[PDB]
Ligand binder design. Structure first.
Ligand SMILES: [Fe+3]
Length: 263
């Protein structure tokens, strides 16, 4: 049914209201210009939900979680009450367990963190498509998440839109900006990633720690990068990666987003 998986950049919560971000106009054009098909359900691997073992969201309605401090009060008024899919949740449990993940937990009470509901509120604003969330295991490695994606790969034939939500670059809150360029280290890293992805060098991206330039500056902590790996795996071995968006915030926080097309 569905032959694509995506990695997008959840940005920061300001992307719900800051229209000075091309990221927002990009996400808003989702159903018209990016993915026209209506998916049966949506699975989001969001970087803002990390756990020790794979964890799935099992609720019939997602609560809208404001996992951010220090923003306009308008942001805490938002509700993206999309349904959950216990169907999909179980399907994910079984698919993951069937591939070697013996311990895979479930949370029957939590909804969507801003890593899911902020983008989804722009792409699918009616809030009527089931959204189920998968967690990222930050203290593991990239290959683990590639495998989590491979395990999820069959979900596509069942109308599931697999989306990893992170940031192409996620420099520390302590990294200094660039006044009117794009920081050299960040362009190096983004260039590396594109060259890897568009050529299907997925083993390389699994091994970013030993092949990417400036990865410690780009991803000091991996959580915002591992959803890329998951979408990568879910697309498949010979999928075709395309860069569908890029924009920068401080000259250092890339918003790059990729579409993986299985063949
Ligand atoms: Fe974030």
């Amino acid at each position: 049914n569905i032959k694509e998986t995506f990695f997008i950049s959840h940005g920061t919560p300001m992307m719900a209201i800051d229209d000075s971000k091309p990221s927002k106009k990009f996400l808003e054009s989702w159903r018209e210009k990016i993915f026209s098909k209506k998916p049966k359900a949506i699975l989001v691997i969001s970087a803002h939900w990390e756990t020790d073992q794979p964890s799935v969201n099992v609720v019939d309605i997602n609560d809208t979680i404001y996992d951010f401090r220090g923003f306009p009060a308008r942001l805490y008024q938002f509700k993206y009450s999309a349904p959950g899919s216990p169907e999909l949740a179980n399907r994910i449990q079984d698919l993951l367990a069937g591939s070697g993940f013996k311990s895979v937990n479930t949370d029957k009470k939590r909804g969507l963190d801003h890593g899911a509901w902020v983008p989804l509120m722009l792409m699918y604003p009616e809030a009527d498509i089931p959204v189920c969330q998968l967690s990222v295991q930050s203290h593991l490695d990239g290959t683990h998440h590639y495998k989590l994606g491979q395990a999820l790969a069959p979900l596509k034939d069942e109308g599931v839109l697999i989306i990893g939500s992170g940031s192409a670059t996620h420099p520390s809150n302590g990294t200094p900006p660039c006044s009117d360029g794009v920081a050299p280290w960040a362009a190096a890293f983004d260039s590396w990633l594109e060259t890897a992805l568009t050529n299907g060098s997925y083993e390389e991206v699994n091994k970013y720690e030993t092949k990417a330039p400036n990865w410690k500056l780009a991803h000091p902590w991996p959580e915002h990068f591992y959803p890329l790996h998951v979408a990568m795996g879910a697309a498949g071995e010979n999928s075709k990666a395309e860069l569908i968006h890029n924009s920068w915030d401080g000259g250092i926080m890339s918003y790059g987003s990729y579409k993986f097309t299985s063949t």
